[PDB]
Assembly symmetry: C3
C-alpha cells in the first residue's frame, strides 16, 4: 500500500484524487484487480461522484452543511462534530474495479477526498488488489 | 467482470438486483470469495436493505426526498443535484461475502440499485473475487 | 471461511466498538497483508468507522441522525452508515487512523445481532 499526502485549504472541500488512484495503479502494474481508497481520518472521507462541473461538489457540500450545520445539538463542543457525521455519510473508503490496467469507472465519475474540517495535512491510502 | 444493462422507469426507485448478483456468482463457479457490485453512475448508487416489505424502500426514497428536495439551493444547471447527493449517501458500490457458493446475506437483505434520476439507460458491474 | 461474532445490543440507538473483534479475526487469520471486510447482515443496523476516543462524538452522530430522520427510520440510517466497511491489513495489523474505531451501528435494538468478518488475500 502507498500513502499519499494531501493539503486541504477551505474548511470543507472535495479534492479530486482520481489522478492519485491511477498513479497507484500504474505503479502496481496490475492489469486486473481492485483499487481500494481508504481515508484514515474521522473528519474526512472518500466518495465517488461527478468529475465535471464543480457546481456538483459545491451543491453536495452546501446541502450537507444545510442538513448538518456547524452549530447545533453537539455535546462534542469542539465544533467539528458536524464533520464527523458527514465523514460517516460519505464513507471511510470506496473501491474501484481495475480492468486492463485502468480504473473501470463512469465517464465523468471521479474519486474525491471529502474534507469537512480543513485546512489540514491529510493522508489517503491506496491498496491495489492484484488478480 | 460481468456487466448488466438496466433501464430504469421512475425518476427515483429501488431496483432489486440480488438475483442478478446471485447469477453472477453461480456462473462464476466461485465457492468462497467476495462479490463487488459497482454503480458507474453519479446519480444512482448501490445499497442493501429490506427485501420484503415494499413500504420500507418507499419510505427511504420519500425520506431522502424530504431532506434533499428536487428544488432548492443548487447551482448545478441540470437540476439533478439532489440525485448526486443521494448517490453519494447510498454509495457507489457494496460488497457481499461469498460462502459455500452463495451470497452470505441476512434473511431480510436485498441488494438494490438506487436510481435517483431515471428513466435512463443504466449499467451495474459485478466483480467476483476469490 | 468467515468469522461470525454475536452482539447483544440494548438501547434503541448505539455505536458498539468492535475494533478489537476485527483485530481478533485478523490475528487469527494469520495474514500479514490483505483486506478485512466487516459485514452487517441486518437492515436496521450498519457498520461505520469514526472517532474512537470521545464518547460524545458517537452520541452526536446518533442524536443528530435521529433529528433529521426521527422502524423505517432505522432502515434509512442503516443505509446511510452502510452494510459494510473495509480495512487495509498491513504487517498483520489493521491500517487504521489514530482515532479510528470500527463501529456496529444499532438503530433498532435490543436484539441478538451478528457481524461477519472476512479476511482477504
Amino acid at each position: 500500500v502507498i500513502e499519499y499526502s494531501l493539503k486541504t485549504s477551505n474548511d470543507d472541500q472535495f479534492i479530486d484524487i482520481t489522478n492519485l488512484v491511477k498513479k497507484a495503479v500504474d505503479e502496481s502494474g496490475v492489469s486486473d484487480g481492485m483499487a481500494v481508497v481508504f481515508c484514515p481520518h474521522t473528519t474526512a472521507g472518500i466518495t465517488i461522484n461527478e468529475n465535471a462541473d464543480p457546481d456538483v461538489t459545491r451543491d453536495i457540500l452546501v446541502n450537507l452543511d444545510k442538513v448538518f450545520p456547524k452549530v447545533g445539538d453537539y455535546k462534542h463542543v469542539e465544533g467539528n462534530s458536524h464533520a464527523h457525521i458527514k465523514a460517516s455519510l460519505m464513507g471511510s473508503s470506496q473501491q474501484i474495479i481495475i480492468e486492463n490496467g485502468k480504473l473501470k469507472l463512469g465517464t465523468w465519475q471521479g474519486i474525491y477526498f471529502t474534507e469537512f474540517d480543513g485546512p489540514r495535512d491529510r493522508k489517503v491510502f491506496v491498496k491495489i488488489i492484484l488478480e
